[PDB]
Design a protein around this motif. Structure first.
Motif, PDB file in Angstrom:
ATOM      1  N   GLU A   1       0.850  -1.179   0.000  1.00  0.00           N
ATOM      2  CA  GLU A   1       0.000   0.000   0.000  1.00  0.00           C
ATOM      3  C   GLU A   1       0.887   1.230   0.000  1.00  0.00           C
ATOM      4  N   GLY A   2       0.489   2.276  -0.703  1.00  0.00           N
ATOM      5  CA  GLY A   2       1.218   3.549  -0.622  1.00  0.00           C
ATOM      6  C   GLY A   2       2.404   3.613  -1.549  1.00  0.00           C
ATOM      7  N   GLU A   3       2.850   2.455  -2.038  1.00  0.00           N
ATOM      8  CA  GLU A   3       3.829   2.407  -3.139  1.00  0.00           C
ATOM      9  C   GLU A   3       3.394   3.248  -4.330  1.00  0.00           C
ATOM     10  N   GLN A   4       4.317   4.025  -4.868  1.00  0.00           N
ATOM     11  CA  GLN A   4       3.949   4.810  -6.036  1.00  0.00           C
ATOM     12  C   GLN A   4       4.177   3.935  -7.229  1.00  0.00           C
ATOM     13  N   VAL A   5       3.238   3.882  -8.167  1.00  0.00           N
ATOM     14  CA  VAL A   5       3.524   3.134  -9.405  1.00  0.00           C
ATOM     15  C   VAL A   5       3.212   3.874 -10.715  1.00  0.00           C
TER      16      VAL A   5
ATOM     17  N   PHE B   1       0.452   6.989  -9.975  1.00  0.00           N
ATOM     18  CA  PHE B   1      -0.389   7.161  -8.776  1.00  0.00           C
ATOM     19  C   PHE B   1       0.139   6.309  -7.620  1.00  0.00           C
ATOM     20  N   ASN B   2      -0.343   6.560  -6.386  1.00  0.00           N
ATOM     21  CA  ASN B   2       0.058   5.716  -5.264  1.00  0.00           C
ATOM     22  C   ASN B   2      -0.983   4.662  -5.035  1.00  0.00           C
ATOM     23  N   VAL B   3      -0.528   3.429  -4.849  1.00  0.00           N
ATOM     24  CA  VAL B   3      -1.470   2.302  -4.783  1.00  0.00           C
ATOM     25  C   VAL B   3      -2.124   2.231  -3.439  1.00  0.00           C
TER      26      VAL B   3
HETATM   27  C1  LIG Z   1       2.614   9.142  -2.270  1.00  0.00           C
HETATM   28  O1  LIG Z   1       2.381  10.315  -3.017  1.00  0.00           O
HETATM   29  C2  LIG Z   1       2.381  11.464  -2.201  1.00  0.00           C
HETATM   30  C3  LIG Z   1       1.943  12.671  -3.020  1.00  0.00           C
HETATM   31  O2  LIG Z   1       1.252  12.233  -4.169  1.00  0.00           O
HETATM   32  C4  LIG Z   1       3.775  11.675  -1.621  1.00  0.00           C
HETATM   33  O3  LIG Z   1       3.758  12.780  -0.746  1.00  0.00           O
HETATM   34  C5  LIG Z   1       6.156  13.244   0.350  1.00  0.00           C
HETATM   35  O4  LIG Z   1       7.047  12.289   0.882  1.00  0.00           O
HETATM   36  C6  LIG Z   1       7.926  11.789  -0.101  1.00  0.00           C
HETATM   37  C7  LIG Z   1       8.733  10.635   0.480  1.00  0.00           C
HETATM   38  O5  LIG Z   1       9.729  11.143   1.339  1.00  0.00           O
HETATM   39  C8  LIG Z   1       8.841  12.911  -0.580  1.00  0.00           C
HETATM   40  O6  LIG Z   1       9.669  12.430  -1.615  1.00  0.00           O
HETATM   41  C9  LIG Z   1       8.031  14.098  -1.087  1.00  0.00           C
HETATM   42  O7  LIG Z   1       8.888  15.200  -1.282  1.00  0.00           O
HETATM   43  C10 LIG Z   1       6.936  14.475  -0.096  1.00  0.00           C
HETATM   44  N1  LIG Z   1       6.037  15.441  -0.696  1.00  0.00           N
HETATM   45  C11 LIG Z   1       5.826  16.632  -0.144  1.00  0.00           C
HETATM   46  C12 LIG Z   1       4.874  17.544  -0.858  1.00  0.00           C
HETATM   47  O8  LIG Z   1       6.372  16.993   0.900  1.00  0.00           O
HETATM   48  C13 LIG Z   1       4.245  10.437  -0.867  1.00  0.00           C
HETATM   49  O9  LIG Z   1       5.616  10.564  -0.563  1.00  0.00           O
HETATM   50  C14 LIG Z   1       4.025   9.177  -1.696  1.00  0.00           C
HETATM   51  N2  LIG Z   1       4.259   7.999  -0.881  1.00  0.00           N
HETATM   52  C15 LIG Z   1       5.481   7.664  -0.480  1.00  0.00           C
HETATM   53  C16 LIG Z   1       5.594   6.426   0.358  1.00  0.00           C
HETATM   54  O10 LIG Z   1       6.483   8.317  -0.766  1.00  0.00           O
END
Ligand SMILES: *[C@@H]1O[C@H](CO)[C@@H](O[C@H]2O[C@H](CO)[C@@H](O)[C@H](O)[C@H]2NC(C)=O)[C@H](O)[C@H]1NC(C)=O
Ligand SMILES: *[C@@H]1O[C@H](CO)[C@@H](O[C@@H]2O[C@H](CO)[C@@H](O)[C@H](O)[C@H]2NC(C)=O)[C@H](O)[C@H]1NC(C)=O
Ligand SMILES: *[C@@H]1O[C@H](CO)[C@@H](O[C@@H]2O[C@H](CO)[C@@H](O)[C@H](O)[C@H]2NC(C)=O)[C@H](O)[C@H]1NC(C)=O
Ligand SMILES: *[C@@H]1O[C@H](CO)[C@@H](O[C@@H]2O[C@H](CO)[C@@H](O)[C@H](O)[C@H]2NC(C)=O)[C@H](O)[C@H]1NC(C)=O
Lengths: 175, 183
Positions: free
Chosen positions: A21-25, A93-95
């Protein structure tokens, strides 16, 4: 709208991928330069929902014509590359449980879609498990993190870093 | 050291010939890119492997670390000193790509390859041509095996010199691969 499947649809559509969950894909699309005016990514979520939903882009300079996903996926982003001999487009998107489903690559006019290939992103699934084997075996990009509840809401799944689907899933084997 | 060196032990993906598009005839100097996109996997490295049509034997590869995508070895630097590659991490998979400007000298068979040092698994094959032999309608890509072009309307034609080209001793190292597909 009257849908058609590419000759090699089921044989270049990878098997389901269990993802944390929450993984970006990113759902990646690549088509060789072609006569349709529009491309779309079509999503049929596994959880709630029926019918389908599409991000649609002008097949050429890639403009967003229509964004069915904008709701379930308010925070996704798409991209569109012109390669001359073809094009890449993609939905990132994030899953979540809420956003796991069957994503498809579609060549499109108004009346018809040609369906190029299908991705199935799962977050829970109703036991060794690799990164992708060519061939039909549910896989994961990070199999080692694979946990396993006997419950309702985290059925297998990927640890901290029926379905509208079960039938599609049931086609493929588990390793 | 490290030229000549084709892939030691090559293997082909189950669906290699059946997700390899037919040849695409393309205008000289057109800048085209070569894709790839593979699904997260177990190999340490990826490569785009090129076997040019005109003078060069064996093969040449851009090789990247499979993961953060750094360049480990650039066999192409020579014939294609000016190409650029890109590597995208998608989590469920990766996209990598070679971009260059096509010429007679650099049209050939490009391949997407999964790679350790002894072996390559060959995913799919693109064939880029600039001239095509003749001893004629032509579309943008038909799914199925028909030599295509991205800009067919621009299609000119000579007799033999350097064959069909694109507007504004011996054979090819390609004519056999080309000869497979229909025109
Ligand atoms: C899921 O997506 C959201 C936004 O769509 C991400 O939101 C942050 O945390 C990330 C991980 O450290 C950073 O890389 C980003 O800079 C930070 N974004 C902001 C605006 O501060 C979220 O990270 C994503 N999920 C994961 C696990 O990273
Ligand atoms: C939608 O695509 C279809 C197929 O490519 C097109 O309609 C079929 O195309 C062939 C070739 O013209 C015809 O023989 C069939 O009768 C077509 N079927 C129908 C119902 O039209 C069509 O051109 C595309 N859609 C639009 C809006 O042009
Ligand atoms: C081949 O590629 C070169 C550069 O990679 C193209 O020329 C460049 O075009 C870019 C984009 O406009 C410019 O920013 C550069 O200044 C150009 N550099 C040079 C050296 O031309 C070139 O157009 C491509 N080939 C063709 C036929 O267009
Ligand atoms: C490079 O990849 C190949 C192919 O996947 C590996 O060779 C296999 O290794 C397994 C485990 O040793 C053997 O059981 C198989 O016989 C091998 N298969 C083939 C087709 O060769 C190889 O070990 C990897 N090489 C390195 C140097 O890590």
């Amino acid at each position: 709208a009257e849908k058609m499947w590419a000759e090699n649809y089921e044989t270049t559509s990878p098997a389901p991928v269990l993802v944390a969950e929450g993984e970006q894909v990113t759902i990646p699309c690549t088509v060789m330069t072609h006569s349709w005016p529009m491309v779309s990514i079509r999503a049929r979520f596994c959880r709630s929902h029926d019918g389908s939903d599409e991000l649609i882009l002008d097949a050429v300079k890639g403009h967003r014509l229509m964004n069915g996903l904008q709701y379930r996926l308010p925070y996704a982003t798409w991209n569109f590359s012109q390669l001359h001999l073809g094009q890449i487009f993609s939905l990132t998107f994030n899953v979540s449980t809420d956003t796991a489903g069957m994503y498809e690559c579609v060549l499109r006019n108004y009346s018809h879609g040609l369906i190029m290939q299908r991705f199935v992103i799962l977050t829970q699934l109703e036991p060794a498990l690799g990164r992708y084997s060519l061939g039909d075996q549910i896989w994961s990009p990070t199999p080692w993190r694979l946990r396993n509840h006997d419950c309702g809401m985290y059925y297998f799944y990927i640890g901290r870093a029926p379905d509208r689907c079960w039938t599609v899933i049931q086609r493929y084997r588990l390793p």
